[PDB]
Structure 1
Amino acid sequence: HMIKYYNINGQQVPVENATLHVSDLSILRGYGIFDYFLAREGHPLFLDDYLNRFYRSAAELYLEIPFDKAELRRQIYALLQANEVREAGIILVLTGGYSPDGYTPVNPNLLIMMYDLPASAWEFSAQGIKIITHPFQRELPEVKTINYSTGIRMLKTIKERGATDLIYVDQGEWIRESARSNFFLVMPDNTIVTADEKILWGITRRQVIDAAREAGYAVEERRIHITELDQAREAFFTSTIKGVMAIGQIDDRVFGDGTIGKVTQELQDLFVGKVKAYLETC
């Protein structure tokens, strides 16, 4: 394949003509929401859950999506067909729109953009990644806003310090999530622990919590103190692109020998199970 079209406000447009006027509130004021999901075998994965979150995020910024969910789903499928692709990354963006005063939102601009399935998608490396803690709390964390400035600004420091990612700790006390991932601990008794509050409710997080409970693991959704890293055997990320990704080091702590923990490897397999089961309903 090669990506020929995006969709702006219900119209398929060649990628090279896909533009917004500079008065768009995303450009001037960072006012917008988005979602991102993969397609496999021609089907966006868990699509109803992603679209439900997109409509919920939009409601929290008082931005009306111009199409109902069934019509949005049609445009997404139509865009897969127009690009002639079965495997893809799909972005949805809803901006504050072409504001008259550079502040008051009006009709949003809706973007559907499409890319190759990321090469790294569900790599499931046996080698855990290395991350740093960073004291920070995302704004409006339950809403998928376009606001990624702390995450992006931290790229230089992350790379400088020999890490590939970070875990946000609210006031250096409470473990939350990374800029683009949910965060989980596995304790020595095999209890899975993940933040309940002041985080984005990831679609991957949902599927992994459900799979873990179906397998008979105890999954605690609660606040996690920074000191509880020392009680954990395993640490992992969930996200649309990562699936389940082993974390082998946080700051000066190696999780086991740095390689993927047993419950993490099991959750990887069960995640792939959830994906296969989804694609069987399509």
Structure 2
Amino acid sequence: HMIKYYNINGQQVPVENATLHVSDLSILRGYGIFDYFLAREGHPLFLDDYLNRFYRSAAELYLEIPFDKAELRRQIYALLQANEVREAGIRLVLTGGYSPDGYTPVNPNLLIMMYDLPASAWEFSAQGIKIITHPFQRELPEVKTINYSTGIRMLKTIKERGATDLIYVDQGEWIRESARSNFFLVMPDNTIVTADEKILWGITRRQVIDAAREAGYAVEERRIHITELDQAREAFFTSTIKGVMAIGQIDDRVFGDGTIGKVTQELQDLFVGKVKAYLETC
């Protein structure tokens, strides 16, 4: 489970030597974007989707990625091989770079970090998790910025309350996403519902929506009023690491008996289907 190397700016570097000078704008100014994906069987999953997002994120902050997509793909595969792993987490980071004035981007720094496949990845627990609502709206929500100020600061509140996560509700009226996951409801007629605006367009959310539609579920992408939690039978998260994770309780509302609902469970299987399908093209 040893990771020997990261990559900074196209060079493989021993993990213990992977450092940035303190003039980096991520350090001074929280200025950067990132992406994160799994590799299984030697292959980053849905890699083209993740790379497209990373490139779009970067354009929205006016940061030039120093390599084209094919070259970045090569550095990622080479990093997998240098670390001798087939199953991994992979973090891409693009900082504002070393700035003259501690404010203006000049030259982004590109990081590629690697981890063991997270131990909890795709656990697919039958017992739903317990989350709280939190009134908040992420800034630049369609961009995967490095800014997790509120998300990280809320850990103490979450934990204090007996929860393990939250769902952000824009002005306490409109359901969005957690700090790190997209959020879905399943209605009693088996319509799946998820927000369409002022959220991060997850890659997992994409694959799950396509898989759902292919299975013959209706998926509405729309604004979601907080009151609509009381109409839902089921609730779940999507994310790279969670896959599809049942939510058993929100605040004082228990969904079902707290265990994974039937459509959520099918969506777990369909998601694994997408993964396999992807890996068949590799």
Q: How far off is 1:25 after superposition?
A: 0.2
1:148: how far off? 0.4
1:4 alignment counterpart = 4
SS of equivalent residue, structure 1 residue 245: strand
Deviations 1:168-195 (A, max 9, x none): 0000000000000000000000000000
1:44 deviates by 0.2
In the TM superposition, what is the alpha-carbon distance from 1:266 to its structure 2 partner? 0.2
Task: String of CA shifts for 1:219-264, please: whole Å, max 9, x gaps.
Answer: 0000000000000000000000000000000000000000000000
**1-structure distance, mates of 2:191, 2:61:** 36
Residue 94 (str. 1) matches residue 71 (str. 2): no
Offset from partner CA, 1:18-51 (integer Å, 9 cap, x none): 0000000000000000000000000000000000
Taking only the aligned residue pairs, the percentage that are identical comes to 100
- How many aligned residue pairs are there? 282
Residues of 1 paired with 2:146 and 2:139: CA distance? Answer: 11
Distance in structure 2 (CA, Å) of the matches to 1:150 and 1:74: 35
**Counterpart Cα distance in 1 of 2:3 and 2:157:** 33
Q: Which secondary structure state, in structure 2, belongs to the residue aligned with residue 224 of structure 1? A: coil
**Counterpart position of 2:33:** 33
CA deviation after TM superposition for structure 1 residue 129, in Å: 0.1
State the alpha-carbon separation in 2 of the partners of residues 254 and 265 from structure 1: 17
Superposition misfits of 4+ residues, deviation over 6 angstroms: none
1:128-173 residue CA offsets vs partner (Å, 9 max, x unmatched): 0000000000000000000001000000000000000000000000
Match of 1:149?
Answer: 149
Name 1:243's counterpart in structure 2: 243
Measured against aligned partners, the alpha-carbon deviations of 1:101-125 in whole angstroms (never above 9, x if no partner) come to: 0000111000000000000000000
Aligned with 2:35: secondary structure?
strand
TM value normalised by structure 1:
1.00
Aligned counterparts of 2:122 and 2:145: Cα–Cα separation in 1: 24
Structure 1: runs of 5 or more not aligned: none
Partners of 1:2 and 1:99 lie apart in 2 by 34
Q: Helix, strand or coil: the match of 1:269?
A: helix
- Give the secondary-structure state (helix, strand or coil) at the position aligned to 1:264: helix
- CA–CA distance in structure 1, aligned partners of residues 3 and 269 of structure 2: 31
TM-score relative to the length of structure 2? 1.00
